[PDB]
Design a protein around this nucleic acid. Sequence first.
RNA 1: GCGCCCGAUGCCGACGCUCAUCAGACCCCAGAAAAGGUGUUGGUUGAUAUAGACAGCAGGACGGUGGCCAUGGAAGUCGGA
Lengths: 198, 52, 156, 190, 175
Amino acid sequence: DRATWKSNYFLKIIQLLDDYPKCFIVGADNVGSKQMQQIRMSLRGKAVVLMGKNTMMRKAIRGHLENNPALEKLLPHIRGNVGFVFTKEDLTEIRDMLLANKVPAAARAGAIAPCEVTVPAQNTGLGPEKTSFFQALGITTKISRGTIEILSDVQLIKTGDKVGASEATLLNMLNISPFSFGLIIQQVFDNGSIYNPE
Amino acid sequence: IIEPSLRQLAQKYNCDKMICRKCYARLHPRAVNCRKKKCGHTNNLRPKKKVK
Amino acid sequence: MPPKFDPNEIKVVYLRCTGGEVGATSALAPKIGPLGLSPKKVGDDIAKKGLRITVKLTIQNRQAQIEVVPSASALIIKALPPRDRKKQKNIKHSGNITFDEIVNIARQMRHRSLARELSGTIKEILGTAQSVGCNVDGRHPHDIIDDINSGAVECP
Amino acid sequence: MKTILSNQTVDIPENVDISLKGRTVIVKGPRGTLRRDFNHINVELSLLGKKKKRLRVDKWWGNRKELATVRTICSHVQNMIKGVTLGFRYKMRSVYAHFPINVVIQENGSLVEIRNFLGEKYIRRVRMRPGVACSVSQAQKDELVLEGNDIELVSNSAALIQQATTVKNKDIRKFLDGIYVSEKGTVQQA
Amino acid sequence: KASGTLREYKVVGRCLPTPKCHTPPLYRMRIFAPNHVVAKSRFWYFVSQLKKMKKSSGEIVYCGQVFEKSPLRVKNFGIWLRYDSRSGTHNMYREYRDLTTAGAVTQCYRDMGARHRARAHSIQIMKVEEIAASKCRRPAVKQFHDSKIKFPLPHRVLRRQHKPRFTTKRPNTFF
RNA sequence: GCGCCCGAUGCCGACGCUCAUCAGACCCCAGAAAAGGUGUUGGUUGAUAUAGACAGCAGGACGGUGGCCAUGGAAGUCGGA
Ligand SMILES: [Zn+2]
């Protein structure tokens, strides 16, 4: 926003960081409109979600204000968009309550495919569209049970698939993309030490 | 026969154009000022009439 | 689905209406009847307001639809007060009917709301989504952004 | 204005080689050799680095319409690099409604014969640019494949063939039949 | 007027001391004129322009240049000008970079006459102040404070009509 | 007035502006306008910028939601208060 929201939320993020004895870094590089809310439902049962438009930006100058030792293992956590969650629970709990919905990161116009994921032979949750969003991929289709179903057992999702908004349509529809990064629980601050939660 | 792909590619080369209302010149749709110099590099333009 | 209506997995979001209209849809009970395959009898059994049709809800039983209850307080608010059609009064009323102790029902059957907290935020979407009568006023109330903080007429 | 200095630098892949005598830049790599002599561009082309890491175009005391040229020369020599290391390929699909475009390649490397256009009994022998190999492909039903090294050359030939097949005194908003450059490409890919 | 190389005169004047009040105040102006006679006349122009005095009702108490403070220090001046432009008066703030303030103002006149074709009889200077690199603002000036600057003589050509009209070799236009 | 016709710059002349497929080139004087130009400069004012501002990238283009509820059909509906 303006400098006003900046000024307020710079202090607001440190407010929550000081209070909640457990900080969590979750990514907002790629999360679509519904891929957002399907996680945001379970994020907050006794908790707060606060991703960065100025909060995470404030740390770029926090780094010399020294609230806790070893926030220079979360400020060098800057590459790629990241905001925060805050709870009082475990951190394995937090890992699994960002996976009780299994966030399928969604993308902007002109996205990029980094990886490879073999095609699912039955659909992974379709939105409102045709069987063109099936046969433009290469997975034949049949009318079936309350799950709109496809039919093919070949790899046409390839590391090097030319992505775009023409596919981000079907990404907000079927909701699995070759991209990888987003709302994850791995980066948990409790008073200055980093472990390997996974 | 004009299959959809060939169509919406040919109509890129022959339909989506921007025209200088004083000099009658085909311009790419981004164009704001006519590339000629007999109209005077004017700013006003019009989109190409879409066929029936 | 838009031309064909394949059996949708209910993450989809689509219209649920037309408890009778033959403008150009060519049916009465469903919008899934002509575009799909189903009889028209559960719909007139439902037809067994106030000068209108019933704004429907649609679920998929692997091939078919069973007429669903309005699943929030929003449309039960339209079960109270000009119930004449084409009213249209900003919004359907001014507030002369108790929204007060009836809204609390819809904070338990909303298995659909996303991004809502301890019930002080569950109440937010479920008291803001409906837009009928200012709870009692000719306002457009913005004291129930977050539905337990700045107060309303329903609660202390 | 006369900005005192503007610069641009290209990091040359090692697998290529560049020689220079004044503005004449010659690039020799895997697929062959190309020349280009930039007279009246009036810049400083310099080559620096062990394994000739970088090239530096420098324009001194230029005006605005003259600093414009520096990145143009950058892109020119960049596309030269792209050709010598990869090679350019263009692909053409010929739209038709009721008269299937009959394109054959009368001689091997060039001299494309075109006939059965709209019903025209007029044959055409479109002469591809020197140093350009035409090849009707077969994995796509109606596909011309133009290949070369100088993108100038291949694309010039490409637009030439496209423009040589167009209607006269007809509506180009409904009559559309003809060949068109479709999907600009290279030979081999990373 | 007819500018040669402007010299920055300073003038102080007053109205004649009428019997009503023993002496009116004294006014100081900093005026750029190629000779002090023109300095006097243009001082009267400015004074009659501002307050109701004329050389008929005034005498020029002091008239002499200000020798330049440190004419060996390169200094970049911001100059607040106001001219007339064949369609209405325009304010304007130009910038120059030279040694003597007089040099800066003469550069301003020359480049106004060229780059804006307004004669020297329609330009009335308000301020010329030497200012620091953090207050200089147009880029053309801004590009000349670097601890190290280097730029070759790009395309250098000089006179060869005194050196023979008819030589047997040809000039080198590199160094 | 000073390239040559044509006596005079055959000066180290100084700072700039301008590319005209009808350039321009000196009182009376023998080529014209209103209106336009992201041609190229100068200038005035207003907005935003490393805490990255601007284009091209990680978002984002709807989850509640048929939410009001027009049924003149319209989670967008245009022509739905
Ligand atoms: Zn034009």
